[PDB]
Each structure stands twice: as structure tokens, then as C-alpha cells.
Design a protein around this ligand. Sequence first.
Ligand SMILES: O[C@@H](COc1cccc2ncccc12)CN1CCN([C@@H]2c3ccccc3[C@@H]3[C@H](c4ccccc42)C3(F)F)CC1
Ligand SMILES: O[C@@H](COc1cccc2ncccc12)CN1CCN([C@@H]2c3ccccc3[C@@H]3[C@H](c4ccccc42)C3(F)F)CC1
Ligand SMILES: Nc1ncnc2c1ncn2[C@@H]1O[C@H](COP(=O)(O)OP(=O)(O)OP(=O)(O)O)[C@@H](O)[C@H]1O
Length: 1170
Amino acid sequence: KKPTVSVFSMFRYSNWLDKLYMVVGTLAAIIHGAGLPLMMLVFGEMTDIFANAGNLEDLMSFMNLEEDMTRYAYYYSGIGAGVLVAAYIQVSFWCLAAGRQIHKIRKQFFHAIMRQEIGWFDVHDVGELNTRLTDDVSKINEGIGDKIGMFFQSMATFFTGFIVGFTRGWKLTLVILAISPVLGLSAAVWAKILSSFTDKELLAYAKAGAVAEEVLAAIRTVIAFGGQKKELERYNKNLEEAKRIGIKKAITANISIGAAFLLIYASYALAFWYGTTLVLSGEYSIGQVLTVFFSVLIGAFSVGQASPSIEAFANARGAAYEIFKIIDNKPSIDSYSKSGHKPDNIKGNLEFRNVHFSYPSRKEVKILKGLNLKVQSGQTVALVGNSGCGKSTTVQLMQRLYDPTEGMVSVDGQDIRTINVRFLREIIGVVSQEPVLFATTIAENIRYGRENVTMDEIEKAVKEANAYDFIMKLPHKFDTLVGERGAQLSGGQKQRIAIARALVRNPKILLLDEATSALDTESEAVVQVALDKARKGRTTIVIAHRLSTVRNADVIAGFDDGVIVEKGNHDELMKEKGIYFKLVTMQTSIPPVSFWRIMKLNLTEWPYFVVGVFCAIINGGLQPAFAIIFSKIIGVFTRIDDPETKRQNSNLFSLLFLALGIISFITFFLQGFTFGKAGEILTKRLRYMVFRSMLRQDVSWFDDPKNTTGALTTRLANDAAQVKGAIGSRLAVITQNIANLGTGIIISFIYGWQLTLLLLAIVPIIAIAGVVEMKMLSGQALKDKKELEGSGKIATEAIENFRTVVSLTQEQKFEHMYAQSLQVPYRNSLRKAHIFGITFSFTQAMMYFSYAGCFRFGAYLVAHKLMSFEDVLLVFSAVVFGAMAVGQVSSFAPDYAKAKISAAHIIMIIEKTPLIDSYSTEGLMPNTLEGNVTFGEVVFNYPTRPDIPVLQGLSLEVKKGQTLALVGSSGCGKSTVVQLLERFYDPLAGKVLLDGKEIKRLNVQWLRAHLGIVSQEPILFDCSIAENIAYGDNSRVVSQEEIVRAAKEANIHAFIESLPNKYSTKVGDKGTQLSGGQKQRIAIARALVRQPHILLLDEATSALDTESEKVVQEALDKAREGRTCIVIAHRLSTIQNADLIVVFQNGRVKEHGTHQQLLAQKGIYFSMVS
Ligand SMILES: O[C@@H](COc1cccc2ncccc12)CN1CCN([C@@H]2c3ccccc3[C@@H]3[C@H](c4ccccc42)C3(F)F)CC1
Ligand SMILES: O[C@@H](COc1cccc2ncccc12)CN1CCN([C@@H]2c3ccccc3[C@@H]3[C@H](c4ccccc42)C3(F)F)CC1
Ligand SMILES: Nc1ncnc2c1ncn2[C@@H]1O[C@H](COP(=O)(O)OP(=O)(O)OP(=O)(O)O)[C@@H](O)[C@H]1O
């Protein structure tokens, strides 16, 4: 973060080869940059040879104009040969040196990250650390890459040009030197603008991007509450600012380039005026004036080309400071370490004694105050207590995830503090609540625990757990491919295979932490069976929720208020009547779009396009005008006239130069203004329409795997801003290229056809040379960050779940995987360095060889009296310099192909029409609904995978005032029925009624606004508390009285009153931290403001504590009252407070009856409640 680090300390991983590369690259760069200010020295003397003979011929009316020009053809070929070799060395060597140093840094930085222990990752954000690995290293690479050689080349050009200017003629050099600072400043500004191109500016758009992300991620709730119009309004309000910022950016860029060109042409005019004054006197010659002026001007404008390199180097140092800080940091308990104490046969005897512990982030407070245990081999320890006493702190402390501030922990006599770190974490097997799985196969995940394991032990471990049927029935058996972070598998299966993975390690001291994790009922029972199967000959500390499995335990340690007080088995705790007994009583592809359609999108802004095309014509018509004026101004001295006529003509031509500069600035500003405004308006309109279309489309469209939230926001952020490049930029590029190149070719053919025909063969190569130079100066080949995606995925999945990784003792494994994934792109970059170097060198050298070829043929033609020197200059400066300008213009513009590809998607999504339209005004909104929801033989299938049906003709019938309960396995039709009753999807078959009226003819907006729902998981908006609670009945301004009475009804109007600012806190962020109980209560409060006639809930309490669950449950029970409320919950939570129970079996209903019938009969419901 600090750029104040020594220059040479940056080059710390420099081998001998890298240092030799740097020195030879620097020498080659100094050589290469001395060519252009030297070609204007040969070009000056060549002009004198042509001009001197021209005076002699005119006086006589071309003897040695063909012999002398032979020598100067060699000089151009020599300078071109040097640039052919020097430029190859400069670009390739510096890129090779940087490509090698960064490879060491990238591997070494990942070595430091894995070395750091838990606690370092608490202070250092995992997201920020992941960002530094992928972006800061790239910043370093850009800083120490080709830009250093570019800086050396620019400085060499500056010094060589000024030396040549002073040596040839000092009088003219001083005049340009006086105005040199402003030229250098303008060049530096233009270079910084050019380098800061091709990177998307999302700082302005982030405001709207946050809203888009939150809406699209939570599209279910937005559709449920019918707030889509409000979200669209908010999105437009946010979009306006980004539109303004984009307009300003475009205007600034065009102003900068226009100022650069204006200064160039003004310098031309002043220098030529003073040069004519000198030449008429006789101090100088036309060739000497050309040499001095061109050399000094190139030198002055080249000192600004090195400006981006200095800033890049400073930023590289600043970004490398933190990376080097992490590298040289030594953890105290690092897993690597160096050997350590290691017993042969550790029997296993845990020991806690005076354990005082505090979390490093908040060490001012303490959680542990003297925990002490005496569990020996073969026993079992259980922990019971309230939420907040620190029942997982000891779990993390046992396997040396931290260090106790006071006291000691011992195992088998010896203290843990003197023990080999790898051995300890190897003998300590652990499981947690979340069964995190890696992207590799199930068998590969199993092998991840211990590498040197064959298939036989994996089979044994799977047999021990419960997977030898679940994975065998699945395709691909053991090697089943885990995809999309374990999308196929569900929670219980992941937990079972995580138990198997823990079994694979064959540990000696097991350690379970909240393994239950409320995995419904059957999954929970199976997990408990697997857990008890696992615990046979192992010292375990079993922390369990619901406090039912803790009954059977050798020592049920009572974790209450730090130091454990309650102790003993169930009978002793029952006699003592402590926290254990109390809580026990408590519990018991797309075809391309034609250019015409894309053009029609921005048709409403036609005047902008008209003015822009006119300005593009006037702007592109400037290079041939410059060629004509240059040829005329040199021909003024070529011919024999009287001095006064020469002076007057030269002054006229200088004024023409100044007028050209003024026109260039004006047209650049106007073209930028018009085209930028048109593009920004088009982008805003496209984003608005795409967002509206996305909101209108049904849930099935979002459920499609291609249409993910990330993909949709990427479309809305990138493609809707790239579409503008297929109309305005395309028109400007084509118009400018035509109006310069065609005009130059036509003018050249009129004045000379032989030389034009010869020069028409190098035009493609010169244009490609300009394109290559412009695509290297802007770093377009360096902003790319592809071919490292696999390594980035490995790094992310190893740094995000670093706790599981460090508990699994796998650092060398991930290090080697990262190195292997980095190996191939290293060699690819090494080859691409040479490829790019040779391409740049050849393309640059063609520009130097063109002089020799063109002027040799021109010498022949002039000798044989077929044209004049002025015509040769006109043809050259119109066919070659025009080609350079064509190549440069065609590169400083967005790519046309990607623009049309994005426009295809934009046009596809804009015109899309849904099935369940959410904007259909047609409807039959009645007076009052009695909430009679019935289902008849309804068969439904998911749209993404219409292969196995979910519903098999359900039959359902509910009257007003009756509370219906439905129970079944997890993932069954209950959630799908909830979705379908709200008309989220379309049933394939069956009928849905509502007070005798079919659901087809009911208005969608009326239905979704006529009832309220509570989501299975708590979903919250980042708006204020007042807005988040007023996000219920929309299209109506609500008062605070309704809000407060709903909060009172929801049993939440205590915590809100116990908060600063009351009903104004920024909910979902800052320090609100509602946990889960308060989130559920505020969600049901938001659902209660609408006063729905029918209320739907689905597993509100899923993974809450043993205290906040009761408050939410009683709030739900109170909220029902006289409403047609459907309820899905965890078994006895609300199943017995209802009236009728519905049983689901493979989607279709199984039995229908009251509680007494189902309980008395030996049915499935009795089976799962026995
Ligand atoms: O390609 C080399 C070598 O070019 C030649 C070699 C040999 C003979 C030649 N004969 C005639 C013309 C070029 C010749 C020169 N580039 C030409 C292109 N510069 C670009 C550039 C881009 C767009 C508009 C104007 C400019 C000009 C300088 C500049 C300043 C800062 C950042 C970038 C640049 C500027 F703003 F003033 C870099 C140097
Ligand atoms: O092709 C033109 C015009 O380019 C464009 C025209 C219109 C629109 C454009 N839009 C985007 C990019 C380029 C555009 C640019 N060359 C390249 C830049 N000059 C090079 C050059 C090289 C290094 C440093 C400074 C310069 C500048 C002039 C100069 C004088 C004598 C010999 C060569 C040159 C100078 F010493 F003062 C020639 C014109
Ligand atoms: N990442 C963390 N950084 C700092 N303090 C934390 C962090 N996680 C938890 N704590 C604090 O550590 C203390 C003990 O946490 P505790 O073990 O009770 O966590 P838990 O997730 O509720 O688990 P358990 O229910 O098993 O006890 C609490 O005061 C808690 O706020």
C-alpha cells in the first residue's frame, strides 16, 4: 500500500539471466530510440540533393540524381535494419524478464498465504486477499514489463532529437524549445488518456449495479410483492448519473486529442515561418530546417510518451509493498514450521487446565475463564449451554487453531505447544455444520483427506458411513463429477460424505461440532446413525443441538458462563437441576442481426448522427490537405522564384497550417460531443428497456441455467454499453477512413500514377504497423487476464474455505496444484513474447524501408522527367502517411464484431414476450376474496429439467378459517405448491380454483398484491427500516401507525425501540446484524402490513437457536388468527396446532384425515413421529 520501497528491492527475484536480459534490453532500447531522430537527418540531406538539382535544371532550361540517391537508399536500409533488430530485442527481452520475475512472485505469494495461520485471515479479509493475488500481481507485471523499455526508448529519442537539433542548427532549436513545455504537457496528457483506454469505468455505474444485483438476486420477492415498477424507477434514477459521467469522459478524451493535434499544427506553422525567414537570409537550408524542426519536435513530443511508465512503476511499487510484507511474515504456529516433537504411539489423554482465551480481533473481551477437563482414552464429552458461552472456541482451540492466553493444553502427557503441527492436525479429525465440498469428484474429495490411500480404504470408509447405496445409485459411481460447487448433491448427502471423508483420515481423537445442523428429520436420524457408528474407539467431544443425543454420554460437561460448572452424566444433572435439565425440559447461437435493425435503435437521435458524420468528413479530409500544403511549401523552395513571392506563399501556407489545426480541434470536439451523447442516450434507453423486460418475464426465465444473476447483470452492464459501438463508432471509423484514404489515393493518381502504383503495395503493411503500435501503446494486449482462470479458481476455492483446508492439512497439495495450473501459460507467454516482438519489429521497420523504396523510384522518375519532387512528396505523404492515419484511426475505436454479438443478445431479450405477463391490465378483480384455494389433479414439472414429474395429480380443498398442514420429505412438492399457488409457474395439467373462479382468468397483479408470503430463508433489502417495512402493500402511501401496530403484532416492537434512530436504521448492513430470529420477525412484520386474506409460510424456523426459535414460533402462531394460512414446518413445531394434515408421497398425496386418525393408525405419519 506504500509506494515508498527501494527500486532495487523490487528486482529481488532477479536471476543472472534476468539481469542480463534487463541490461541488454536497456541497451537495445537506447539504440532503437535513436533511429527516428536520425532518419530525419538523412531525410534532410536527401531533400537538399533533390532541391539543388532542381534549381540547376530550371536554370539550364538530373545527371547524378540517380547515382547520389543510391547512397541514401542504403542509409535508410541501414537504419531500418537496426530497428529490425533493436526493436525485437527491446520488446522481447524486457517481456521475458518480467515474465520470469512475476512467475516467482505469484508462486511465492501463494506460499505465504497458506503459511499464515487462522487469525491472520480474520484481520485480513478473504475477499481482499483474493483480489491482491489476481490484480496486484498483474499491476506489478505491468509496472516491471515493457513499459521500462518504452521509457528508456522515449528518453533516448528525446535526447537524440535535441542533440541533433543543437548540432545542426541551434537558432531554430531554441524557438521550439521555448514552447517545448506545453507540447510536452499536452503529449503527456494524451499519452495518459491513451494508456487509460480500453478499461471499463464502472465507478459511476456501481450505484445502479448494486440495485440491479439486489433486485435480480431476490427476483422472487420483487415479483411476490409487485414492486417491480418501483425498482425500475429507482434503477433509472441511478442510471442518469452514470450517463452524465460517460458523456463527460468522452468529451474530455476528445478535447485532449484535439489539443494535441492543434499544438502539433501550430508548431508546424511557427517553425515553418521562422524557417522561411532563415532560409531567405541564407543561414540555413530547406533540408537543414526540416532536420532541425522534425528532430526537435519529435524529441519534445516523445518526453510525454514516457509519462505512463513512471506512474506504472510507482503503482507497481505501491502494490508490491503489501505482497512483500506478507511474504516476509513468520507465523508462530505455521503448519510448515520445521519438524517438531512427534510421539510414536499416542494413547490419547486430553487435558484442559486454566484455559483463558480471547479472540484476537476483540481480545479486550474474554470468553474463557479456566476451562479444565480430564477426559481419558475411550470416553465421550458433551457440551451444553446457552448461545454465546463459546462452545466452539474450545473446539477450535483443541486442534491448535489458536493459542490460549493463559494456561496449557496437554495430550498424552506432553503439552500441545511442543508438538509437530502436521502430526497434531493429522491425528485430530473434525466435522462441522456446513459440509463444504471441493469441485473435484466425490472420490477425489475423499482422497483429499489423505493422498496415499487406495480405492480399498475409500470403499471401507464409504461402507462405514451411509453412502455405499446413495452414490452407487447415482451415475458414475465413485468418480461422479461434482459440478457447480456440488449442485447435484443436497445437504444431508454432503454431510454423510463429509463424515466418510473424516473417517478416511483414521484419526485418534475425533471432534464433532454441531453435526446435526437440523437436517430435516430422516436425514438427521441417518446422520446420527453414521455419527454413532463412527465413534467406537476414539476420544470425542460431541457438541449437539436440540440436546437429545447428549443424553448418552460419559461426561455431559456444562458450558455455562465461561468455566464449566455443571458436570456428570444425565442422572447427576437431573438431581442437580442445572442448565442441562432446564434445556431438556425446554426441548421436550443467435443469428447475427443486420446493421439496419441495429441502426434503428438509435434512430430517434438522427441529428446527432448527421452532425457527427459531417464532422467526421471534415476531420478525415485533413490529412490529404496537410499533404498538399506540405508539398506546396517544399516546392516553394524547390523552384526558382523571386524572394518576395516565396515569402508571401510561405506565409499563406503557414496560415493554412494554423487553420488546419483550428479546424481539427473544432471538429474533434464536435464529433466527440455528438457521438458520445448519442451513444450514452442509447445505452441508457437499452438498459431501461432490458431491465423492464427482465422484470416482466416470469420466474421460469430466471430459472434457466444460462440466465444466472451474474450473467444477467453482466449483460446489463457490458452488452448494453457495447451496442453503442456498432453504430456511431462504426459510422465515424468508416467515414473517416474513406474521406482520408480514398481522397489521398485519388489525388495521388492525378499527380503521378507510377509512384502511386508502386506505393499501393506497401499500404496494407503500413496500416497494420500503425494498428500494432496503437494496440501496444494502449496496453490492449496486456489488460487481458485469460488462460489464468483455472489457477484463479483453484486459488479462490483454496483461500475462501481456508479453515477446512487447514483443518485437512493440505497446503502442499494446493501449492502443487496451483503451480501445475500456472505452468502452461508461463510457456505460452514466453513464446508470445517473441511473437509480439518480431511482429512489432517488422511492422515498425517497414516504415523505415518505405522511405528508401519510394524515394529511389522517385529519383528515377524525376531523372527521366516524368514528375517533379513536389509530386513525389505529395504522393508519399498522401499514400503512406494516410495509411498510417488509417491504421491509427481504425485501432482507436471499439471492436465491431463484439458490438454486433452483444446487440444480438440485447435485441433478443428486448422483444421477448412471456407467458404469465406481469403487465397485463386485463383481469376480473372482485370485491372480496374468501381465500378458497383448491387443487385438482394438478400435474407439474420443472422447466429446467422436465424429465421426472414433481406433482402427480394433487387433490386439495381448503375453506375460510381452516388452517391446513402438509408434511413430507425435503425437496418435495410443498415448496412447489407454494410457488404454484402464487402463479409463479404454469401447471402443465390440472385445475386451480379460487372461490369457484379459475386461476387462468384472474389478474396477476391483483392476486400477487392480494396475499402475503414469508420466505423460507430470511431475505432483506438494503433500504431503510421504514422503507423495508413499507415494502408491502404498494401503490399506496402507508402511515407509521400501521407499521407500529404490525410490529406489535409481530412481537418485534421491542428490539426496534431498543435501537438508535428507531425506524431509520440502515437494515441489512452497518451493524444491525439481525441474526435469524429478528430477520424472521421483521419478515413476518413486512408480510403482516398488507393484512392478507390468505398467508403462506414455509419452514420459517430451520437453523435457529433454542431461545429465539420460540419467539418466532409464537409470533407465527399469533399471526394466523382468522386467516386461510398454510403452514410448513419442522414436525411438532406447528403440526399439532393445525386442524388437518396432508401427507406427501412422491408428490401425490397419500392419506387425508385429522390428527386423531393419522396418529391412531400405523401410517407413514405415525412412522416419522414415533
Ligand atoms: O511510429 C513511431 C515511428 O514512426 C515513424 C517512423 C519512421 C518514419 C516516420 N515517418 C513519419 C511518421 C512516423 C514515422 C512514431 N509514433 C507515432 C505515434 N505516436 C503517438 C500518437 C498517436 C496518435 C496521434 C499522435 C501521436 C503522436 C505522439 C504520441 C505521444 C504520446 C503517445 C503516443 C503518441 C503525438 F501525439 F505527437 C507515438 C510515436
Ligand atoms: O497519422 C497522424 C494523424 O493521426 C490521426 C489523425 C486523425 C485522427 C486520429 N485519431 C486517432 C489516432 C490518430 C489520428 C499521426 N502521425 C504520427 C505522429 N507524427 C509523427 C510523430 C512521431 C513521434 C512523436 C511526435 C510526432 C509528431 C509529428 C511528426 C513530425 C514529423 C515526423 C513524424 C511525426 C510531431 F513531431 F509533431 C506524424 C503524424
Ligand atoms: N469470526 C469471529 N471473530 C470474532 N469473534 C467471533 C467470531 N466468531 C465468533 N466470535 C465470538 O466468539 C464468542 C464465542 O462464540 P461461539 O463459540 O459461541 O460461537 P457460535 O457460532 O455461536 O457457536 P456455538 O453455538 O457452538 O457456541 C462469541 O462472543 C462470538 O461473538
